[PDB]
Amino acid sequence: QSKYIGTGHADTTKWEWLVNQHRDSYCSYMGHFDLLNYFAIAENESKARVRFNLMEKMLQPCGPP
């Protein structure tokens, strides 16, 4: 279970859990077409630009520890 990214243990910090769920969310946005559509309609940007901004946010979606 250690190999699957996102799993945790008793010493999992708040930051680790939340960056995990943020990257999960970004990948879920990339996967589900209508979620990305909603996002691109909200902030008036092309779908490719929204995907690029999400992939850019994958580095530190929450900030440094």
Partner: protein
């Protein structure tokens, strides 16, 4: 009452496109196009004689298509279709023109289901000779299958080969035309291991994107990570350049403001800046990237078509000295709406699948070459600060031969009989930006389109005049006045700081610039700024396309709510309230305040007379009439307002709403508040004592989009994640007792995001139904069952088709409709009607198990559709 058992049917299939590929799928010399509508795989055939697109096959795959590519074996005559899905499976399909179906040739399993982070499915890349395919996740895991044929010329797949690399994110993957060498796959990767272990944030900015090459050794049968070169600026996707005998192998990295060519070995990297638009009205700090690409190979030459954010399509050619490439050449081809995929067919036709709005098929008339238009190159010198420039112009190289109607994206819908016909009409506010539209749909459907100016958010109908009051709002956009002001300031800057004696030339050029108003419909709208907002209030006749009155708003005022109502203080004269946010930043969220415009609606439902403008703390997101007064949601506050001479006057408020009010609907003295995340909240208004007390909520979090009250205790709602729920209060719930929790009596995943639910009767003299609309352009209905016999029959039909006719892309149907919540009391009719698509033996067996005959089952399903209810 009894639990409601529902039956789901799609009346209008989804019309948006996320992927499009072209090839010889029939095995003949004709070329077809396979498109992905989201949860639907479709096959289209453009007729080169009449220049019009026909649909040959449409299939519900009951999954999420995340990647789509076509390939062909060596010496083959027909192209296969590889589909990356939200199941842990890869599928390869062959189209059979005789049976008119997608035969599943191969289905191989590797991971778990869902749009997961480390499970392959998102990216698909095939070797140009068809010898292998690679399915990749966005993180870590990558898998390669080897494709071959056998004695009988049937496709064969191998076991997966592991190409994983921990802590590695993937931007894009594509195969490299290395001829018949060891197949190679190029990936745009980035390692975040350094950025996570540096609590100062330096490693974040220091980590850079890499171009990596994965080689598949066939003789050794394994994948190895050979070359990995860091890149200067971050690129969004890759293009395979033809290699082997007809072209030099390599890759084209598309980045922000640049396009680079790179190849392994002594090949020098050759970059070229992207030509910006001359007199670009956008923000100077805004970059420019490519949104999609296409490739067309001929025995003579080959070129690429790359479209920018502004919709400009450029033709790209590669000039090569022997083995190496000298320079990249780019010239302005044309301007079409922003597309998600482009296909350059043989026999001279281009197919443009727009990311939103209608789709287009053009005939290529002149490739170019015989043009005086400037061609740009990567060798032309240019200072570090400057770039190339070009001027947009009307279509020259393409001609519109067909236009395909697409309702995506639908942002609001009202089903009502505004015309004096008997059957109700569907009034759908959809489209995006300058390509938005209000469409009247009538009895699969017949559509009439009236163009709008910005993206519609919500519209209301005036009961007395039957006219429509629409609000259109878009982010980072300029208003009409601000657009004219920017044009004038640009023209003033143009004449000044120019050379004397040639300032005469600057003046005539700037006059021409001011005279030219380029159509935002085709050329896109000049949109810029982070917190800028363009909003417009419109009055429209539902019969004609005419606009009756129009109100532009401030450069930072964005409308989000609208309602028309009579007031008890002021007789029967109508009013129009419009909620507006000011200085709204989406990320991170920050708003200065909000306003509520009160208009009089003076003429016979034709003119808006500004009464006053009430300020308020946060954005007014919901406005609904309530017994001679209005209920307004501002932020997480729910207030009752009454009309005053100079303001809208607060009379009672509720503060304990969880997060933020996104919509409110009332029946009786009960108000149903939709929260952005914490689902529905039942609040009660006490006329005596004038207090708004929360008496019920829900036990699950729901990102509610829309809602519709079925009865006094029952509410139907929709998710951002494409779900529909029906939640009912306990029967003996007292509005006096606070701690009451609602029970969810229905759950169902549509697979597409719903933005309008309405309980109506589509055909007079029919039963009631729950009609939902789709952000991807679909229209569906949920029908209540009349008897338990029909319920058991259709439930057994669902079971037998789940077993004997599984979804096409490896998904499990019961798992799929249980995407976020397990299914509760819904039957999937879109699956049940696939009984007519099975083979004779399967149909006979299923009908015999149902103790019926196959025509009888088809008749029953068709009858449920004839009811439309």
């Amino acid at each position: 009452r009894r639990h409601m058992f529902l039956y789901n049917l799609t009346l209008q299939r989804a019309t948006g496109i996320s992927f499009a590929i072209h090839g010889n799928f029939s095995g003949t010399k004709q070329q077809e196009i396979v498109v992905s509508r989201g949860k639907i795989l479709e096959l289209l055939r453009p007729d080169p004689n009449t220049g019009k697109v026909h649909t040959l096959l449409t299939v519900e795959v009951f999954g999420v298509i995340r990647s789509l590519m076509a390939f062909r074996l060596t010496g083959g005559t027909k192209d296969y279709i590889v589909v990356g899905s939200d199941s842990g499976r890869i599928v390869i399909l062959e189209y059979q023109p005789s049976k008119n179906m997608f035969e599943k040739i191969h289905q191989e399993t590797f991971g778990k289901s869902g749009c997961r982070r480390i499970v392959p499915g998102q990216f698909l890349a095939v070797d140009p000779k068809g010898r292998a395919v690679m399915i990749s996740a966005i993180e870590k895991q990558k898998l390669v299958y080897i494709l071959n044929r056998d004695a009988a010329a049937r496709l064969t797949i191998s076991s997966p080969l592991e190409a994983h690399k921990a802590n590695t994110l993937v931007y894009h993957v594509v195969g490299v035309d290395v001829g018949f060498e060891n197949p190679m796959f190029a990936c745009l990767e980035m390692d975040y291991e350094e950025a996570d272990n540096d609590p100062t944030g330096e490693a974040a900015a220091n980590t850079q994107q890499t171009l990596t090459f994965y080689e598949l050794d066939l003789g050794l049968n394994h994948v190895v990570r050979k070359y990995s070169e860091p890149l200067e600026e971050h690129g969004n996707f890759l293009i395979t350049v033809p290699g082997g005998s007809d072209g030099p192998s390599g890759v084209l990295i598309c980045s922000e403001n640049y396009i680079t060519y790179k190849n392994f070995g002594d090949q020098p990297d050759i970059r070229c800046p992207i030509p910006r638009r001359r007199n670009d009205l956008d923000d100077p700090e805004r970059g420019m990237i490519f949104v999609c690409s296409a490739t067309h190979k001929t025995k003579s030459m080959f070129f690429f078509l790359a479209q920018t954010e502004q919709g400009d399509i450029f033709k790209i050619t590669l000039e090569t000295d022997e083995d190496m490439v000298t320079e990249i050449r780019l010239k302005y081809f044309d301007t079409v709406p922003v597309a998600a995929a482009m296909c350059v067919l043989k026999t001279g036709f281009l197919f443009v699948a727009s990311e939103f709005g209608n789709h287009y098929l053009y005939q290529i008339a002149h490739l170019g070459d015989d043009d005086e238009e400037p061609e740009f190159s990567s060798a032309m010198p240019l200072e570090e600060g400057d770039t190339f420039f070009f001027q947009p112009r009307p279509l020259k190289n393409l001609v519109l031969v067909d236009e395909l109607d697409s309702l995506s994206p639908i942002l609001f819908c009202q089903i009502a009989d505004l015309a004096n016909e008997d059957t109700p009409q569907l009034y759908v506010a959809c489209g995006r930006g300058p390509r938005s539209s209000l469409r009247v749909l009538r009895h699969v459907f017949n559509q009439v389109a009236f163009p709008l100016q910005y993206t519609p958010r919500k519209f209301v109908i005036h009961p007395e005049s039957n006219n429509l009051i629409i609000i259109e709002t878009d982010h980072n956009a300029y208003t009409e006045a601000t657009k004219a002001q920017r044009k004038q300031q640009m023209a003033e800057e143009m004449v000044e700081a120019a050379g004397e004696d040639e300032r005469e030339l600057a003046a005539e050029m700037a006059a021409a610039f001011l005279n030219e108003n380029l159509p935002e419909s085709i050329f896109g709208a000049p949109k810029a700024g982070n917190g800028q907002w363009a909003s417009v209030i419109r009055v429209m006749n539902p019969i004609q396309g005419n606009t009756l009155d129009l109100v532009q708003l401030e450069q930072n005022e964005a409308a989000f709510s609208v309602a028309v109502c009579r007031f008890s203080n002021t007789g029967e004269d109508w009013y129009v309230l419009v909620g507006v946010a000011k200085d709204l930043i989406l990320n991170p969220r920050s708003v200065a305040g909000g306003f509520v415009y009160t208009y009089k609606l003076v003429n016979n439902g034709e003119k808006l007379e500004f009464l006053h403008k009430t300020p308020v703390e946060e954005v007014p997101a919901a406005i609904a009439p309530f017994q001679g007064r209005v209920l307004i949601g501002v932020g997480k506050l729910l207030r009752v307002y009454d009309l005053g001479k100079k303001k809208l006057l607060r009379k009672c408020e509720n503060k304990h709403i969880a997060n933020y009010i996104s919509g409110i609907q009332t029946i009786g003295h009960r108000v149903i508040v939709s929260d952005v995340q914490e689902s529905f909240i039942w609040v009660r208004y006490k006329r005596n004592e004038n207090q708004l007390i929360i008496f019920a909520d829900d036990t699950y979090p729901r990102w509610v989009t829309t809602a519709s009250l079925l009865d006094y205790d029952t509410v139907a709602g929709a998710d951002k994640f494409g779900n529909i729920c029906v939640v009912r209060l306990p029967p003996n719930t007292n509005d006096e007792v606070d701690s009451q929790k609602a029970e969810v009596i229905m759950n169902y995943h549509v697979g597409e995001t719903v933005l309008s639910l309405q309980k109506t009767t589509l055909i007079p003299g029919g039963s009631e139904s729950l009609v939902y609309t789709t952000l991807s352009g679909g229209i569906g209905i949920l029908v209540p069952f009349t008897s338990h016999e029909d319920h058991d029959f259709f439930q057994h039909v669902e079971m037998h088709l789940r077993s004997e006719h599984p979804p096409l892309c490896g998904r499990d149907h019961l798992s799929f409709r249980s995407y976020y919540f397990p299914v509760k009391n819904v039957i999937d009719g879109d699956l049940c009607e696939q009984f007519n698509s099975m083979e004779p033996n399967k149909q006979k067996n299923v009908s015999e198990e149902l103790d019926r005959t196959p025509p009888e089952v088809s008749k029953k399903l068709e009858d449920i559709r004839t009811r439309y209810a």
